[PDB]
Amino acid sequence: IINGEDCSPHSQPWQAALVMENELFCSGVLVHPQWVLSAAHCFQNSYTIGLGLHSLEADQEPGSQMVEASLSVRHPEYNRPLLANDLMLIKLDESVSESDTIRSISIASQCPTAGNSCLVSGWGLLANGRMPTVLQCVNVSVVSEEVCSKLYDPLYHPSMFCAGGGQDQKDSCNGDSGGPLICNGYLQGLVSFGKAPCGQVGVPGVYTNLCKFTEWIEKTVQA
């Protein structure tokens, strides 16, 4: 997260850490006691998932759980066309007990509103090119579809939307993939991709447009 700050601890109790040999590579979002939503490009044959974290050391985080998962379902249209439909559902080996620090979040049914100020959270790179010690939070504003398609031509697809690109250079960065974009208290997007390098002035990041996928998510998770 570029030009954000420490989240208030456990203010984002749906946040999931995807770790591989004790290194974070992506985030996800608890959307059901037994399922984490993430970007399809974060796919792995198995996962270690941190719930209830703030720093990435579980033994310093009362209420935290490191859980295993082996099963993931990528959206059937992932990457058709390229970069589009970037979401997947990870089934935890065990359902998780709700607490004050571990809680699911609902997905927005309404599509994003241009001008809406939203929150993105993650453990990805900071402006200084280092990894943060604790979960970072930043506000970014939804941008119009017209600006989004102009900037990301010829790859723009309605499974995507843009947020950020303000003068204050707030953005998602490497390690933030799969993490949540919250608008009006609902899960609106997942960090997906953007221009390298991150934080360029006037360059918003691209988020998976989750309002387009609520039926697919509900049907996969209820099964």
């Binding site: 970007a39 390229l82 990805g124 090119g129 960065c173 490497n174 991709f193 390298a196 390098p197």
Partner: protein, 165 residues
């Protein structure tokens, strides 16, 4: 699924670190820039025996992940993350053929993938980001090996993190 790893078994980073492409069968030669013929500037990518260990590259995906998989379309470039003047692309030039050359422009999504092959990895070029990839191999000329599309005859590399700097 398939994470690209360096010679120490660590995941290759998305843009943040530079890496030497070390040929498994041409280890006496390193990546460098050269002219093909009479062009004004050296912009063809070659393995040159006179340059060791050669110019390190960065692999770049627009995806906000910090590692690289074999399924990702990549830009490959010389130089720092901040600069886009050493970005690889493919240009027809006789007598090499479809040669790998540096440009100062970059698409959001590059045309290369890094795929497992033998002891290491090959670079595969996908014209128009289609479904069909063409192996990058070597054309010997002027005491250098020009990187060029040579489908079925890939140059195989191992990927060595340039932390020595």
């Amino acid at each position: 699924s398939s994470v690209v790893v360096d010679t120490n078994g660590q995941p290759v980073s998305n843009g943040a670190d530079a890496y030497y492409l070390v040929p498994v069968s041409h280890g006496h030669a390193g990546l460098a820039l050269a002219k093909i013929g009479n062009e004004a500037e050296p912009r063809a990518v070659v393995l040159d025996p006179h340059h060791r260990p050669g110019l390190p590259v960065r692999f770049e995906s627009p995806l906000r992940i910090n590692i690289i998989k074999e399924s990702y379309f990549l830009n490959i470039k010389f130089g720092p993350s901040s600069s886009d003047s050493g970005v690889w692309d493919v240009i027809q030039q006789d007598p090499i053929g479809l040669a790998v050359k540096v440009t100062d422009t970059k698409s959001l999504l590059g045309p290369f993938k890094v795929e497992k092959e033998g002891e290491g990895y090959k670079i595969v070029y996908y014209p128009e980001r289609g479904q069909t990839g063409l192996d990058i191999g070597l054309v010997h000329r002027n005491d250098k090996y020009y990187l060029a599309v040579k489908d079925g005859e890939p140059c195989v590399f191992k990927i060595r993190k340039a932390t020595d700097e």
